[PDB]
Design a protein around this ligand. Structure first.
Ligand SMILES: C[NH+](C)c1cc(NC(=O)CNC(C)(C)C)c(O)c2c1C[C@H]1C[C@H]3[C@H]([NH+](C)C)C(O)=C(C(N)=O)C(=O)[C@@]3(O)C(O)=C1C2=O
Ligand SMILES: [K+]
Ligand SMILES: [K+]
Ligand SMILES: [K+]
Ligand SMILES: [K+]
Ligand SMILES: [K+]
Ligand SMILES: [K+]
Ligand SMILES: [K+]
Ligand SMILES: [K+]
Ligand SMILES: [K+]
Ligand SMILES: [K+]
Ligand SMILES: [Mg+2]
Ligand SMILES: [Mg+2]
Ligand SMILES: [Mg+2]
Ligand SMILES: [Mg+2]
Ligand SMILES: [Mg+2]
Ligand SMILES: [Mg+2]
Ligand SMILES: [Mg+2]
Ligand SMILES: [Mg+2]
Ligand SMILES: [Mg+2]
Ligand SMILES: [Mg+2]
Ligand SMILES: [Mg+2]
Ligand SMILES: [Mg+2]
Ligand SMILES: [Mg+2]
Ligand SMILES: [Mg+2]
Ligand SMILES: [Mg+2]
Ligand SMILES: [Mg+2]
Ligand SMILES: [Mg+2]
Ligand SMILES: [Mg+2]
Ligand SMILES: [Mg+2]
Ligand SMILES: [Mg+2]
Ligand SMILES: [Mg+2]
Ligand SMILES: [Mg+2]
Ligand SMILES: [Mg+2]
Ligand SMILES: [Mg+2]
Ligand SMILES: [Mg+2]
Ligand SMILES: [Mg+2]
Ligand SMILES: [Mg+2]
Ligand SMILES: [Mg+2]
Ligand SMILES: [Mg+2]
Ligand SMILES: [Mg+2]
Ligand SMILES: [Mg+2]
Ligand SMILES: [Mg+2]
Ligand SMILES: [Mg+2]
Ligand SMILES: [Mg+2]
Ligand SMILES: [Mg+2]
Ligand SMILES: [Mg+2]
Ligand SMILES: [Mg+2]
Ligand SMILES: [Mg+2]
Ligand SMILES: [Mg+2]
Ligand SMILES: [Mg+2]
Ligand SMILES: [Mg+2]
Lengths: 238, 159
RNA sequence: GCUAAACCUAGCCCCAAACCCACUCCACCUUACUACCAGACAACCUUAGCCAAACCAUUUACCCAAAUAAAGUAUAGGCGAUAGAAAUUGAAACCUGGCGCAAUAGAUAUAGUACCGCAAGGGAAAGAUGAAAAAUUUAACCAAGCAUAAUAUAGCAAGGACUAACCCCUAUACCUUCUGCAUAAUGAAUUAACUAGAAAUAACUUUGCAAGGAGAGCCAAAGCUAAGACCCCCGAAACCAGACGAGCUACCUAAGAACAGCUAAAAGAGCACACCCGUCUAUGUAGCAAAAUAGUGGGAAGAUUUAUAGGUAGAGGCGACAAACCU
RNA sequence: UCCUCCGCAUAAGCCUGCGUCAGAUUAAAAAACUGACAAUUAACAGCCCAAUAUCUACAAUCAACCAACAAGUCAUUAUUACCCUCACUGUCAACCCAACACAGGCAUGCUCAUAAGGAAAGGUUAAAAAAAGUAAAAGGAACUCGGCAAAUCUUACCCCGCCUGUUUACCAAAAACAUCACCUCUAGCAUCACCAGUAUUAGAGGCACCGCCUGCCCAGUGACACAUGUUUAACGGCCGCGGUACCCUAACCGUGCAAAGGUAGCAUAAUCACUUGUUCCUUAAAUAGGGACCUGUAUGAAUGGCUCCACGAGGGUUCAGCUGUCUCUUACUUUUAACCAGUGAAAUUGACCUGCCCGUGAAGAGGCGGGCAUAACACAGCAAGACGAGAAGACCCUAUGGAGCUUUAAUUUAUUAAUGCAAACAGUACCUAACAAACCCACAGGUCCUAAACUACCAAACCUGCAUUAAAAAUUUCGGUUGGGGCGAC
RNA sequence: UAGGGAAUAGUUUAAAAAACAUCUGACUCACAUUCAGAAGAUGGAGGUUCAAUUCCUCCUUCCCUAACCA
């Protein structure tokens, strides 16, 4: 009926903002996704997924200092508070990012690839083949949508024709323009998938409601299915 | 909005069926209004405009029940008012060209009084009528000062 | 002798004729009936189904602009059930009447009130002197039920009788339903009131006129016109359409609140109150209660319990699936 | 004298509903009834903010030390604008939701023990039966389906489910569901769910912690690939017939059949032909329970198999004790009861002047036949009959009566998705057989039985119309006969 | 109790064949394997049909399923 999305704020802050739970309902009030509800209250920390974002009056490569690496309730990865110039922002932390580090945000591609340090953001064309990368965008300047979960990384496979081929965490290949930026290394919290929920109630703390008790007979979809990897996804236009 | 028999057999199930027209967004230029309009049309409308030799002829010729659009009837009122007024706002700097347009469509000219009401819905017409009749009341001071003078005037002439 | 009984108005019904309805000062679309701030939200879109077809599946009458007639004809249709024209034809204007009701009737109506329901919605009952009550003193007698006045061997309760109430003799309530009912088969305490056979085809009977009849149409090889005379009541579980419902309950959202003591100390740990639940027993079963009481129990910092406001709506929701819960 | 749940406040709700006076008469008996007249006073509470930009990483927990995860309730600045001051509303009560002056429901604070709030007995008697208690000789589960209830305050185990949790409000709390864990399936991505997430993710499901494992099968049916195929932790399935060591059984032999032939385990029981098997424990006595063995009509591996800690108002077995459960009851108290006084329901009811025995009869008689009995009428008990009352039997059948559910029942694709085609709209076209016969320039070169016609995808993820295939649904039915129906038969 | 299916050499499977078993021989020092020969059955009875391995009807025989609702 009168559902209003909490995601209404328009200016970037690092102040954690209050978010509202959905219970798996859509704006009609009807259940759209089952199994969502409750959990601990959470505040949202706005993550800036555009790593090469020079300040208002600045341009070109710039550096930032990692002020803190901390826990994030809204994602499985850790986040890092970084500061450069007069600006602070939240970013996805890499595996070994720690307070006091300095990270590089670059948009420069040279004849020679750079030495890839973890936590630095470079265009894909500037990185050696085989570098571990995370927080990839599909179009230059779009912002990282791929390889964002804890402990993840892709691999730079090729650099042909001004395009970069990468391997997604699912092992499917993905072609983008070489000017797309990525971050070197793996996402933080590499042991995230070793966590043991332990008891049913801790799933309720995370905002999961129990599965239906209704018994469903398995159908043709069930059972192992060995199918080839899908063909490479290209975001390039010729 | 209608029904159909499945497989065109009356002994089969009767199903609801809606046939919708195929709609295209095209642009059209009016000579009388000297304006381009982006109008949603059917292929039929394009066939009718051709048989009329243009949008101005199509709008001016076709009657209300065959246009079947309030927009077409606003275009008609618009075109008809320029013809009734010989409006000089059409190509202000080309009196010769302007007169060629008005002559081309001289068949459809009607009095300006009638053209104002062409296409109006009943609810628009009443609002037009209500506004024409909207007049502030006359202060009875003015009404009586006229009766008094006329009363004094007539008395003076008699004697 | 009580309780009662009785009543004739209120109004109402169907027609006719005529084309109705406003502010009354103040308030009222927000939580209506609330003097007084920055907006923009805006209407339109084939009914379906019951039912009939003895199932059901195509199909199944629904005023649509003149009475009549053409005509239940042309035609349509699981060519079934049923449905069904048109051309053409062309009668009538004088509102205030009634072989209508009279308080269980006639409007539901003394009133959409009281009352019931969260809401949409559902929805009553009843009055009775007289010219005067600034005359309170004038009538009977009448249902069931009682009272005046309990009762005496034995029996469908009576009948035949009889000097005599009873004793004697004879005698298996009634309705319905059945092959068949005293049946220990149905229904019925009793009184009052209310409460159930509607019409064509043909035929018959009784008139009129008669090779014609009939006040256009329609029939006629004694017909034809007219008339008389004829076919009940209450009852499902359902189906569909549009509204109204999440103050209960299921789940969720926002923002709150509660959780003593003892043990252990990582805590969906133990013991144990408040609190939440409802294992077992008894009680209660028109209750105290349309699910309770007493004891005994399970849990009680948690997937806890709980106040508030909001959300999801029936072809649906919601569901730790019990086909649970949605007043 | 006794009780104490309580009580007092706030919230919500309610709306004058035990103030006075005057009336009637006060209340499931004897004012909270009628009418008038009064009454709650704001400091508590409610009712709030000029604009635009900008600011806002660091929980709470005595916040210190420590230690966490589920990661959290409390904050501005800049510059403009800004003289004006106490309005309005709630305020009562013995109260609200439960048809009631209802033993139920009802949030917070504070006290609880009370300073606050209340009365279990109308009077009597002291029978039964009934309810609630207390006490009980000797015995101590002999009771019983069962130690139910009481008493006491125990032991050991078996099944099932791991565990806390959850459910049929109002007959089921459970072994059912969820669940940590494990595994299968789908998905490469943003501005309204998922998610301000991004494959260590997120959805759809199975199974059920953990430990040991989870065998074989892709023929069929489904999914996926639709090029031979792949896929069981998808739906599912997982062999016979003869003979051979006295018998039993067959390491073994023959033949056949299948996609594979049931593997590991486990098996006298939530499981059971014989069967209450057999044997060892257990009792004096076991159709119980435990341990084994036999071995499976029809045990068996995430439709999970087999062990095991902990746990359970689960089902079952048991030591010790305990006891009125019982042998076998008794006594007393209160309640109820009965009597007096007040007030005053319900279901029920054809009429009744309403015995017994045998017989009869629509096959079980107060009422009929034959006998027998017989003045009349209260009160208390009882429950054998009145086929007692209650609810138009929930069983069963029938009805061309419904409805829910499921499908390889019939009909259908409206809708939805995909696909094709057509419509709409790019937007430009010459691209696959050289063979020197006296004729041929010192070279870019002539002829003979080969020196030809020569549109590219119809021109996007849209929308319309047509088909097509799917998924999801929708509508409708589910014949009869029948020594009841079904089954069989017809 | 009531319906259905099935009886083919000694065996097990076919539509009157095959592999075994048997018999005869060969090979071997002998046996087995192997090789070459040979015999060997349509359950019984009752039919029809131009002809009975698919067909009867019955018997005899073995199996399979069903035996439910109160
Ligand atoms: C009547 N027969 C068919 C039968 C019946 C049942 N059970 C029932 O019918 C139960 N019926 C209910 C469900 C109660 C209605 C049965 O339970 C059984 C059996 C068969 C036997 C066969 C037994 C046999 N031996 C040991 C005597 C044998 O050799 C085998 C065999 N497989 O070869 C067995 O397994 C046997 O022992 C056995 O288990 C049988 C049954 O179980
Ligand atoms: K029917
Ligand atoms: K009888
Ligand atoms: K009877
Ligand atoms: K009866
Ligand atoms: K329980
Ligand atoms: K046993
Ligand atoms: K045993
Ligand atoms: K339990
Ligand atoms: K009795
Ligand atoms: K019989
Ligand atoms: Mg799950
Ligand atoms: Mg499940
Ligand atoms: Mg009978
Ligand atoms: Mg009777
Ligand atoms: Mg009857
Ligand atoms: Mg009766
Ligand atoms: Mg229907
Ligand atoms: Mg506990
Ligand atoms: Mg629940
Ligand atoms: Mg179930
Ligand atoms: Mg069930
Ligand atoms: Mg015993
Ligand atoms: Mg005994
Ligand atoms: Mg007990
Ligand atoms: Mg199990
Ligand atoms: Mg229950
Ligand atoms: Mg409950
Ligand atoms: Mg019930
Ligand atoms: Mg229970
Ligand atoms: Mg389970
Ligand atoms: Mg496990
Ligand atoms: Mg398996
Ligand atoms: Mg085995
Ligand atoms: Mg055993
Ligand atoms: Mg058995
Ligand atoms: Mg067996
Ligand atoms: Mg099995
Ligand atoms: Mg399976
Ligand atoms: Mg455990
Ligand atoms: Mg429990
Ligand atoms: Mg137990
Ligand atoms: Mg003992
Ligand atoms: Mg009886
Ligand atoms: Mg009875
Ligand atoms: Mg009946
Ligand atoms: Mg029917
Ligand atoms: Mg019907
Ligand atoms: Mg049929
Ligand atoms: Mg029948
Ligand atoms: Mg029968
Ligand atoms: Mg049959």
């Amino acid at each position: 009926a009168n559902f209003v999305s909490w995601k209404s704020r328009t200016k970037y802050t690092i102040t954690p903002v209050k978010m509202r739970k959905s219970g798996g309902r859509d704006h009609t009030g009807r259940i759209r996704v089952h199994g969502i509800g409750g959990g601990h209250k959470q505040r949202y920390r706005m993550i800036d997924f555009l790593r090469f974002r020079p300040e208002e009056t600045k341009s070109g490569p710039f550096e930032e200092k990692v002020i803190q690496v901390r826990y994030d309730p809204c994602r499985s990865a850790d986040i890092a508070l970084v500061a450069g110039g007069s600006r602070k922002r939240w970013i996805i932390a890499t595996e070994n990012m720690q307070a006091g580090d300095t990270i590089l945000n670059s948009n420069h591609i040279g004849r020679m690839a750079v030495a890839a340090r973890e936590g630095d953001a470079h265009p894909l064309g500037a990185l050696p083949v085989g570098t571990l990368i995370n927080n990839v965008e599909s179009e230059p300047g779009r912002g990282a949508q791929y390889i964002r979960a804890a402990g993840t990384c892709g691999v730079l496979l090729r650099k042909v024709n001004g395009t970069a081929i990468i391997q997604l965490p699912s092992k499917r290949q993905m072609q983008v323009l070489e000017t797309c930026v990525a971050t070197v290394g793996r996402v933080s919290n590499v042991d995230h998938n070793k966590r043991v929920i332990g008891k049913a109630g801790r799933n309720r703390w995370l905002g999961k409601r129990p599965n239906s008790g209704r018994w469903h007979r398995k159908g043709g979809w069930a059972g192992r299915k060995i199918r080839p990897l899908p063909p490479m996804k290209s975001y390039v236009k010729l | 909005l209608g029904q159909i028999y499945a497989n065109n057999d009356k002994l089969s199930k009767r199903l609801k069926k809606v046939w919708k027209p195929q709609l295209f967004e095209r642009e059209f230029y009016s000579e009388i209004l000297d304006k381009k309009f982006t109008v949603t049309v059917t292929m039929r409308t394009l066939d009718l405009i051709d048989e009329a030799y243009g949008l101005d002829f199509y709008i001016l010729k076709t009657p209300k029940e065959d246009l079947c659009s309030k927009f077409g009837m606003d275009l008609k009122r618009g075109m008809l008012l320029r013809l009734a007024r010989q409006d000089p706002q059409l190509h202000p700097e080309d009196p010769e060209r302007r007169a060629a347009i008005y002559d081309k469509y001289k068949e459809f000219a009607i009095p300006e009084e009638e053209a104002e009401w062409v296409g109006l819905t009943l609810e628009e017409a009443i609002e037009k009528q209500r506004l024409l009749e909207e007049k502030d009341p006359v202060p009875l001071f003015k009404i009586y000062v006229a009766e008094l003078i006329q009363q004094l005037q007539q008395q003076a002439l008699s004697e």
